[PDB]
Amino acid sequence: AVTGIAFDKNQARINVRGVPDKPGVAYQILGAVADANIEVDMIIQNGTTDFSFTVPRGDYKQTLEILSERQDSIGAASIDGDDTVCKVSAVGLGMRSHVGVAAKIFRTLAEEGINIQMISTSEIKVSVLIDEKYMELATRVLHKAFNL
Amino acid sequence: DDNMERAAVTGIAFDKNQARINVRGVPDKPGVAYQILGAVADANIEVDMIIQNTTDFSFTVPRGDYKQTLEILSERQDSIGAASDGDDTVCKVSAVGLGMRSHVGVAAKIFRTLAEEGINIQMISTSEIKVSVLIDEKYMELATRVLHKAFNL
Numbered sequence A: 001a002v003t004g005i006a007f008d009k010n011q012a013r014i015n016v017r018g019v020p021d022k023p024g025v026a027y028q029i030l031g032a033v034a035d036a037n038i039e040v041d042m043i044i045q046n047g048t049t050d051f052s053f054t055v056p057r058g059d060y061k062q063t064l065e066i067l068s069e070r071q072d073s074i075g076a077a078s079i080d081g082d083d084t085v086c087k088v089s090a091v092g093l094g095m096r097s098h099v100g101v102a103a104k105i106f107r108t109l110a111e112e113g114i115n116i117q118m119i120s121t122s123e124i125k126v127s128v129l130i131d132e133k134y135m136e137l138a139t140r141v142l143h144k145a146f147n148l
Numbered sequence B: 001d002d003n004m005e006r007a008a009v010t011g012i013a014f015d016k017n018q019a020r021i022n023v024r025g026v027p028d029k030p031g032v033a034y035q036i037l038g039a040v041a042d043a044n045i046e047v048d049m050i051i052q053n054t055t056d057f058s059f060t061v062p063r064g065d066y067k068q069t070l071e072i073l074s075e076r077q078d079s080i081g082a083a084s085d086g087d088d089t090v091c092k093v094s095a096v097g098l099g100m101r102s103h104v105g106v107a108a109k110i111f112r113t114l115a116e117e118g119i120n121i122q123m124i125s126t127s128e129i130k131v132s133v134l135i136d137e138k139y140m141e142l143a144t145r146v147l148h149k150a151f152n153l
């Protein structure tokens, strides 16, 4: 089911707030980001809507400046971010089958009172964005929770 | 951008066998999110696209398990801090990211195509490993055609 726990501090969250819910919006945000050729990892979305995504920590300032200038188009209420988050992953080949992973990791991080900001799942991995100060804790909590 | 070709699973999946649950009105006192999902996982329902953008939880379930999820979360809704709705006319579009050098070109494209046809993205949920979105099931054939065209299948 779950064979390893990975973690990675090279993360920055970026938020685009209260953007009109029309087609083409997502593209506008990302396309801007992808022509500065910065990689983007997680993306999360939803008469308004909110668009959160992750950027390698080193691209935090540029991304905010790319969106600051394209805030005209897009037309967002606010643009903020967080460069003190990190990603922690439950990883294991042979997994999609086992269903209570999202739940279990939520449950276990909940006990330690550590807020999950974002989640993404797949056959191969399940990942959460949390504040960096929880990284070790979360890794250890989860590592325990899955018997190594 | 050769990335779609590099994908190991080169393609876009369309799943009309899905339904969106929106658990509305949730307070921020102890691990309430778990009672939500553990209740769904105990019934052995598989879950995907968990979002929390003072804030609500939203997710997807195979369509054949919607009438059950709704009820499992219904008779536990005044046991969990819960004010309120689901949606069983959604279709999930997804591409798998393992193998791709970059994943953002593909995602921005996927978004651009749907935009050009006036198809609105209901929910996004993507990472290095999978790029997935939610659109209205009425656009499924249209989405398949324009997306197949855009990535040459």
Ligand SMILES: [Ca+2]
Pocket: A083
């Ligand atoms: Ca800072």
Ligand SMILES: [Ca+2]
Pocket: A084, A085, A131, A132
């Ligand atoms: Ca912090």
